[PDB]
Each structure stands twice: as C-alpha cells, then as structure tokens.
Amino acid sequence: VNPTVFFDIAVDGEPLGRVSFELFADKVPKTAENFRALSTGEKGFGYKGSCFHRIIPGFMCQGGNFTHHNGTGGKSIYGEKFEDENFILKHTGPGILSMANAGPNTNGSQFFICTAKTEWLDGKHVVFGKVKEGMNIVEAMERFGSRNGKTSKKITIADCGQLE
Numbered sequence: 001v002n003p004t005v006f007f008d009i010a011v012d013g014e015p016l017g018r019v020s021f022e023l024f025a026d027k028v029p030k031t032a033e034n035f036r037a038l039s040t041g042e043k044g045f046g047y048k049g050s051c052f053h054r055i056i057p058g059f060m061c062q063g064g065n066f067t068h069h070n071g072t073g074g075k076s077i078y079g080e081k082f083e084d085e086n087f088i089l090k091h092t093g094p095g096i097l098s099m100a101n102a103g104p105n106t107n108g109s110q111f112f113i114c115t116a117k118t119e120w121l122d123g124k125h126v127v128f129g130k131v132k133e134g135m136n137i138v139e140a141m142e143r144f145g146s147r148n149g150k151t152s153k154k155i156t157i158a159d160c161g162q163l164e
Contacts, residue, residue, distance in 0.1 A: 002026055004164040005039040007047070007157045009137055011144060019113075019134035020163060021097055024089065024127075030078070031085045031099065031107070031128040037077045038064075038109050039160045047109070050074070052155040055145025059118065061138060062100055062149075063157065064110035074109030081106050084126050091118040095131035095138070113138055 006020040023032035038046035045066055052063035068075045076082045083105045091098060091114055098121065100110035107126065115138065131138060144151050 001164070003032065003036050003162060004132060005036055005162050006160060007039070008159040009052075009141065010156050010158040011141075012153045013156075013158075015158070016140060017134060017137040019137050020132040021129045022132045023097075023129040027088050028085050028126065028128040030082070031126050034077050034082070034107070034109070035097075035111065035128065036162060038074075040162050041160075043077050045075070047157050047160045050157045052141060052151065052157075054112075054149035055141060055151050055155065056147065056149050057142040057145045058116055060112040060114050060116075061141050061145070061155075062110065062112040063155075064100070064108075066109065076108050081108055083107070085128075087123045087126060089127035091121045091125070091127060093117045095135055096127055097129035097131070098125045098127045101125060115139070115142060 002025050003023045006018050008018050009016045025032035052061045054062040064074045066074045094115050096114040099107045144153050
C-alpha cells in the first residue's frame with residue numbers, strides 16, 4: 001500500500017491549506033518510509049514545525065530542516081544520512097517529491113517539491129513521491145519565494161501526519 005501523508009501549511013501562522021502526498025513505497029521503500037516516519041513524528045523528531053526555507057518560483061519548494069543531536073539541517077530515521085536507494089523515478093513535472101542532498105549517498109530529511117520538470121536532477125536526487133492533493137497550495141507557496149530562494153514570509157509545516 002503506498003502510504004499517504006499530509007502537511008498543513010501556514011504563512012506567518014495564517015492557515016494556507018493542506019498538501020497531501022503519495023509515497024512510492026513500491027519503488028523506493030526505504031526513502032518512502034523515511035519521509036513517512038518524519039511526517040508522523042514517530043521517531044521523536046520530524047517535519048512538524050519545520051519550514052520551507054528555500055522556495056524558487058518555477059523550480060521547487062525545499063524544506064525539512066530541524067534541530068538534532070549533531071546539527072540543524074535535519075536527519076533521517078536511519079541515522080544522520082542514508083544511501084541513494086535508486087534512481088528509477090524521474091523529475092517529470094510539477095508535484096514530484098524528491099530528496100535534497102549534498103552529494104552522493106547523503107540523504108537526510110530535507111526534501112523538495114518540484115513545480116516544474118527538472119530533468120537535470122535525474123540520477124542525482126532520489127524521487128520518491130508526488131503531490132496527491134493541494135497543488136494549488138504549493139502554487140501559493142511559490143508567491144512567497146524569490147529567485148534567491150529566501151522566502152518573504154515564513155512558510156511552515158504547522159501540522160503533518162499520515163492519512164493512509
């Protein structure tokens with residue numbers, strides 16, 4: 001069963017709306033599971049209260065930092081970092097969910113939602129899900145981004161969890 005997760009997004013505390021995602025556990029089970037557990041919070045850390053700290057209109061919305069024992073950029077459920085599981089899935093268009101990293105086999109918790117096809121990321125960032133509902137919310141988040149990526153208001157994951 002591919003799990004479904006949700007984020008409730010807010011702009012300086014003002015509710016914006018819900019984004020839900022399908023996680024492709026059938027194709028990328030270990031990467032799907034990381035995201036799922038970080039969205040429920042079950043390991044004692046995760047995405048609730050995180051923000052989208054880098055939003056580049058027409059490209060992507062990136063989030064997933066949080067404080068942990070060793071730093072502030074978030075971490076995985078498998079320790080600080082984990083391997084690139086596979087690159088089966090491609091950055092085909094708006095709504096694709098994929099892992100940020102700092103090089104090969106450096107996945108943590110940071111992730112991005114693409115708002116366009118971003119094929120130059122194929123084979124370097126692990127795609128593991130897609131927006132199910134709420135792409136209009138992701139479009140609205142874009143309006144608070146910049147060419148820079150710095151956001152003009154704070155875009156926060158006010159709540160998050162698993163649906164299915």
